Amino acid sequence: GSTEFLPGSLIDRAEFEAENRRVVAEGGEPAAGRPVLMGITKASLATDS
Amino acid sequence: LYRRVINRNNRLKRLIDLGAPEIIVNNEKRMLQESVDALFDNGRRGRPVTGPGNRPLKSLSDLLKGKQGRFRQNLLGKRVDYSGRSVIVVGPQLKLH
Amino acid sequence: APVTHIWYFKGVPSRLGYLLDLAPKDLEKIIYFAAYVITSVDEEMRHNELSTLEAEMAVERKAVEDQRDGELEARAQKLEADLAELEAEGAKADARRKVRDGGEREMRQIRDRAQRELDRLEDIWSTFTKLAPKQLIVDENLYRELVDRYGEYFTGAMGAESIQKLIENFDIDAEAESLRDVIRNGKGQKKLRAL
Amino acid sequence: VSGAAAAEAALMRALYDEHAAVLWRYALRLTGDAAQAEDVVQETLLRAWQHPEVIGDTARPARAWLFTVARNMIIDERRSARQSTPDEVNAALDRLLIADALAQLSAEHRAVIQRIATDLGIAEGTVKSRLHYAVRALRLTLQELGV
RNA sequence: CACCCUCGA
DNA sequence: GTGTCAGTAGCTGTCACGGATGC
DNA sequence: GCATCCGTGAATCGAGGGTG
């Protein structure tokens, strides 16, 4: 949409909604979403730290 | 590892100054590449650099991997002063606390 | 001499191979001096000299063919004369068959020398006509011929310094937007590789 | 012309292809280390290029001349080429006393001992003395505590 | 300290 | 300074799994 | 467009002894 989120990337459902919250109120298109299931091993490496 | 890299680098300087054949200069740059590759992550590409006894040498990246790496061995769990250990024996007369 | 960080080359996925769209094996050949790589090519000068270069290449091929035909003629005539001479000596026809097959063998060797040369010229011209950056040339003699002939039109190099040059002559933003264009509208098969 | 400066290359690259991959094995068996062998090979072949009085007589064994070069270089390397930090208890206890016998002083003896006659703007005899008496006060205090 | 061995809950 | 052949040890007796690598 | 092959990972603490 109008976000800088690279399509196909797995992003926390908090930052996704918080970014679409700014873009929706900015006028651009909010980024689309689709729930994704990650294994614990894969989710651990995806942490922000 | 660092010493082997330095040797090959100084030889490269010699070859450049002496105008050695292009074959030698290029085939030496390749060896410098392989040596720096070993310095950073020995064994990552191809065969590891064997030390005395056909033992693969540890690299800088080997200092951080697995249980013996810096992270798990020396950061997540340290060794502590003011500590001891001994055999345990049942003490029925003791109170729970 | 510049050197490459193994972490970004051999670490899977090959980060450099993803940046320059180079295959990991091709990149391995480049870095460790197994194949040359084209860093730049003056395509406009080549376009302005293509007709002349084509004519010269064609004349070279024709010279090869003419020399081949003359040499084959010499051998065939000596063959006929030798068979007549060994017939005057009265040798048995089996010996003449031996000499016959020997002459055919030698003529085949001559024609094959000429054919290898002709195919070398064909490959040289084909590679120079369809020459682009990021191309690999595993044959060292071929690259030497390319520099000896059309060295004025392109620039090539080997090793890690060549990849340094490739990164230098790289527009990051343009390739990014190209990948995004592929992403907006593409097949999953060829869309995952772009993502 | 330039074809000659190219003939030099095409002369080396034509002996590499026939002898480097075999010289490597020699130095390998003698060192049990493919890395050094890799080095020794380039060292040797550079000398070869530097000594053209050997390859010129093509009909004579060059390989045989190379093996000895390497075999000598290895032994040249084989010439006479053949933890934990204590606990700062004591030192720290010592200073913990020394610091306890520093409050038993006067600020002038202190400012002097913590360093000289060019700054404090006094004599060198005043230095020597203040140092002298100040030490003796330090010694007195320490031995008062029983050091 | 690098590896190695043998062992204990 | 070097000059006739002059040429690794060791080893595969682990496995499950995902995804870039490559035909 | 898909099989191959590469790389990743695989419990915790503790005792003594040897060599490079």
From TrEMBL, chain B:
Family (UniProt): Belongs to the RNA polymerase beta' chain family.
Function: DNA-dependent RNA polymerase catalyzes the transcription of DNA into RNA using the four ribonucleoside triphosphates as substrates.
Gene name, Swiss-Prot/TrEMBL: rpoC
Subunit structure: The RNAP catalytic core consists of 2 alpha, 1 beta, 1 beta' and 1 omega subunit. When a sigma factor is associated with the core the holoenzyme is formed, which can initiate transcription.
Name assigned to this protein: DNA-directed RNA polymerase subunit beta'
From TrEMBL, chain D:
A GO MF label: sigma factor activity
Superkingdom of origin organism: Bacteria
GO biological process: DNA-templated transcription initiation
Residue stretches making up the RNA polymerase sigma-70 region domain: 15-82, 101-139
Entry keywords, A to Z: DNA-binding, Sigma factor, Transcription, Transcription regulation
Keyword Transcription regulation: yes
Signal peptide start and end residues: none
UniProt-listed Pfam families: Sigma70_r2, Sigma70_r4
InterPro entries attached to this UniProt entry: RNA_pol_sigma-70-like, RNA_pol_sigma-70_dom, RNA_pol_sigma70_ECF_CS, RNA_pol_sigma70_r2, RNA_pol_sigma70_r4, RNA_pol_sigma_r2, RNA_pol_sigma_r3/r4-like, WH-like_DNA-bd_sf
Family per record: Belongs to the sigma-70 factor family. ECF subfamily.
Classification via NCBIfam families: PRK09645.1, sigma70-ECF
Protein name, entry field: RNA polymerase sigma factor
Organismal lineage: Bacteria, Bacillati, Actinomycetota, Actinomycetes, Mycobacteriales
Gene it is expressed from: sigL
